[PDB]
């Protein structure tokens, strides 16, 4: 699985940015920084079911 499309839709819905001129590095660099964050309590308890 390639996770460019997960972080691409992250920046579409934050309405400020223009995604068509964002290169590929900043999407896979935003990934490696957003992966260290802990999952919050309501979406994590769904997964454990």
């Amino acid at each position: 699985k390639k996770m460019k499309s997960i972080v691409e839709d992250f920046l579409k819905r934050l309405q400020i940015f223009d995604v068509a001129r964002v290169p590929d590095d900043q999407m896979y660099r935003l990934r490696d920084r957003l992966r260290l964050l802990p999952v919050e309590i309501r979406r994590l308890d769904i997964f454990n079911l």
Binding site: K1, K2, M3, Y28
Partner: protein, 49 residues
């Protein structure tokens, strides 16, 4: 002058065979999917995905 006993021989060879050039046509060749390709350390190249 022509001596018959000194000029008659008995030659020996094979019956039949076939000579094949291009030895690598007897080799079937397939390739793993390129996303799953690994280097010498059995670790995947292009860890960027």
């Amino acid at each position: 002058q022509f001596d018959f006993r000194a000029s008659m021989h008995m030659l020996t060879s094979n019956l039949t065979f076939t000579v094949y050039s291009d030895l690598l046509a007897f080799v079937s060749a397939d390739t793993v999917e390129p996303i799953n390709a690994v280097a010498f350390d059995n670790m995947r190249i292009m860890n960027e995905l």
